[PDB]
Amino acid sequence: TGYDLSASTFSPDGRVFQVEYAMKAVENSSTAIGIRCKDGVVFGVEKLVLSKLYEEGSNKRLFNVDRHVGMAVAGLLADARSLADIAREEASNFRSNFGYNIPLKHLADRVAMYVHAYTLYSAVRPFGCSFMLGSYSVNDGAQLYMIDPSGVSYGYWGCAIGKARQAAKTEIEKLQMKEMTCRDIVKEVAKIIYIVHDEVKDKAFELELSWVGELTNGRHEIVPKDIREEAEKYAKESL
């Protein structure tokens, strides 16, 4: 500890402490899950309802970021918004010039490069948030990439971030996601969300879900209400 007052500093043993602080910042927020299936990608984030007053749909974390990729965040909300609408010009700066649709690997490698750019300057602080990147296409299948404040990019078969990160992943790996279709996936996603969800300290949450893939033909979109409701019914009866 100690030498943790600027991003542009190194520990006595060689660490950037104000990236670990962001690592524990994403810990503060609530869990988010995204699973890559046989022929698509399914996201899911449970949202804490701070008060019944708030209209449903506020504080959304399931950002449509183009026609064919989807994005879910965790951590500091404002900076999550910032990276979100950053990822909607990197797309334009790839389609306005290169015409076709952004591959996930390149989009990640630039947005990860951007967040790493922030993680290395004293005049700025790292974005205290981590987020996911999912999509699908016939020419590229389905992909999922996770980005943390450190600037690291990794593709995941299944992943999660948030204060139930460990429990989320430990519930995730028990599934054969590589060969299951989205219908069997959504119920599992809600199951994981409710299983890892903590109420005794974080009662009054809400379930939110979205996907992209074959069922919607490479078009990112929120889960239709009926599927959401039947999956919620499954999660409740899965008790």
Binding site: T1, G2, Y3, D4, N28, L48, L76, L77, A78
Partner: protein
Amino acid sequence: MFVPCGESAPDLAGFTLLMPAVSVGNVGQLAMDLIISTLNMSKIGYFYTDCLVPMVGNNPYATTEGNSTELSINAEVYSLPSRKLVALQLRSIFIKYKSKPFCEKLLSWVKSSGCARVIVLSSSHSYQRNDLQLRSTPFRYLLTPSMQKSVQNKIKSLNWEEMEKSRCIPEIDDSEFCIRIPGGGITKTLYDESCSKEIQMAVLLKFVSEGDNIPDALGLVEYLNEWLQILKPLSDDPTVSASRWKIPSSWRLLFGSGLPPALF
């Protein structure tokens, strides 16, 4: 004005006295709190003065409900004749234009009382380290001439590192090597006054990083431990001291109250 809690006789004719040095991190205060927590020194009296900024707590060393309701101020005195120990706890900070007369009054009272040893817990600014102390361990020690000439065998055995006191008229090549503790608070004044009074007194300081000082406090209490043995030889492979040094109950949340559920 050292007032006991009940107008009694603390008879501190030969008990080692402990006091911390108000310095960066309050690592001395933290280490002393840990010491009182682990050895459970009882509160015997108060060291009343018009010197420090006044704070009030309710027995931060609380263990049970009964002792929790005991009012606490910045200045209390804990002692333990079981192992011949007496301790002076300081919670708040030093008012301007008052630290040095306070030190003088403290040593005058010590002479009136006559404790055995006047060991001091201190810390120094880690950014004001030369390369010689930057290459080595952050453990440093100073002992008054009256008591060093007798105990020096133990320190010679335990492989400490003597602080190299630097020129206090530095630019002159023949000026005297002289006491200099950066970020020492009242430490240098205490040391100079103690050697002037020829009082057996010890100064142990460490170079401290910043933020949480729990590693710093545990290192400092261990550094006191190997010389004092006021607690069993730790036998560095702990198996106990990993969970033997019980943290005072007051050391609850420190950095804030909680996450305000309005932004995450």
